């Protein structure tokens, strides 16, 4: 045998020892999954809910922009629907983490908006389209409105994008916890602590509390080091929540005023161009519920021992090799800590 220290005879062979080792692995994975399930489901629920809520806000804003174009500028439809749809599609794609340039969204929006304004509102009556698109930026027809919208929406969209990325990475690391493979030495120590008592013919004897403590603090030396970075992650997320619903909902007034602003100098513009051519409640409850799991990694070995059958009294217990009267006494973890450091820097820089 290579695990069960044979002091007397033994009721189990080497193959039974391998079976006990695999059952020890499975029991450890089950205990980790039971410890991490509540938090995993909490973050999954919140990620899904926030995603749907942000999509609802974006859909309502696109609907109101289309409706206000239908009502106030019927001469700009149906082209207005095209550039509004493209703008809010790129908005949603940026929120969901795609490589989209916010300044490019606003600039393409105004580039598409100006030619139809000129042809239908200012000078009623396809090839000259690009000359108008160039004149939009060359003559600064929209004033500071494009940069105002640019900053207004970039500030909110970046914090929302990083909030969702933080939720996703929390889901990732909490999923990773219950799949943590351990050392071979720890496999043998867990087999001794949980099952090797059966090889000596004992039926209901449990391992000593102190033996469980030494074994767990033995193989969780790396996992416990994650606690600092996990605490910093929780607190940085709290820093970030303390943005985007208000901004996207005021966009329509700003766009209407920008169209008015361009129409205000039509006299000179036409001649020159003719010559030239419950959310905040949810994130608050989420942070208040997430602060209840700040001890998750530090309380984890305590959980494994308090949910495994152990003799807390350290009397008439199994010490891994014999029944005693009193007890005598990187890589995946590195990746978890790397990603936590990255997300923590990214959080702290936002707020």
């Amino acid at each position: 045998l290579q695990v069960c220290l044979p002091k007397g005879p033994t009721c189990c062979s080497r193959k039974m020892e391998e079976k006990y080792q695999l059952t020890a692995r499975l029991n450890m994975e089950q205990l980790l999954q039971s410890a991490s399930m509540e938090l995993k489901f909490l973050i999954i629920q919140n990620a899904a809910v926030f995603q749907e809520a942000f999509e609802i806000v974006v859909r309502h804003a696109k609907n109101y922009t289309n409706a206000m174009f239908k009502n106030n500028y019927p001469s700009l439809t149906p082209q207005a629907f095209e550039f509004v749809g493209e703008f809010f599609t790129d908005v949603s794609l940026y929120i969901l983490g795609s490589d989209i340039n916010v300044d490019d969204m606003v600039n393409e929006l105004f580039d598409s908006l100006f030619p139809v304004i000129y042809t239908q509102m200012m000078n009623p009556g396809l090839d000259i389209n690009e000359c108008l698109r160039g004149a939009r930026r060359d003559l600064k027809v929209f004033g500071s409105f494009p940069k105002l919208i640019m900053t207004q929406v970039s500030k909110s969209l970046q914090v929302t994008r990083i909030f969702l990325q933080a939720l996703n990475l929390g889901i990732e690391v909490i999923n990773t916890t219950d799949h943590l493979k351990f050392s071979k030495d720890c496999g043998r120590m867990l087999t001794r602590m949980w099952y090797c008592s059966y090889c000596q013919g004992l039926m209901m004897v449990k391992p000593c509390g102190g033996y469980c403590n030494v074994v767990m603090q033995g193989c969780m030396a790396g996992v416990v080091e994650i606690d600092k970075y996990w605490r910093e992650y929780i607190l940085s997320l709290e820093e970030l929540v303390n943005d985007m619903e208000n901004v996207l909902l005021g966009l329509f007034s700003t766009i209407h005023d920008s169209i008015q602003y361009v129409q205000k100098n039509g006299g000179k513009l036409t001649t020159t161009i003719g010559k030239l051519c419950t959310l905040s409640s949810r994130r608050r409850e989420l942070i208040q519920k997430l602060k209840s799991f700040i001890n998750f990694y530090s309380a984890l070995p305590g959980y494994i021992c308090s949910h495994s059958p152990v003799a807390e009294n350290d009397t008439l217990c199994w010490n891994g090799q014999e029944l005693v009267e009193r007890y005598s006494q990187e890589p995946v973890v590195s990746q978890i800590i790397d990603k936590l450091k990255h997300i923590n820097q990214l959080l702290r820089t936002m707020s």
Partner: protein, 41 residues
């Protein structure tokens, strides 16, 4: 489960982009994230 007891119902299946999650400007998952089918209950 089909939300409507009688007639046309709905069935949803989610597919998240988290295994692995994009980092430092990595390309995001390509295609649809939700799947919805009509069911007759």
């Amino acid at each position: 489960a089909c939300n409507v007891r009688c007639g046309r119902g709905w069935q949803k299946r989610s597919r998240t982009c988290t295994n692995p999650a994009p980092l430092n400007g990595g390309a995001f998952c390509e295609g649809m994230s939700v799947q919805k089918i009509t069911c007759t209950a």
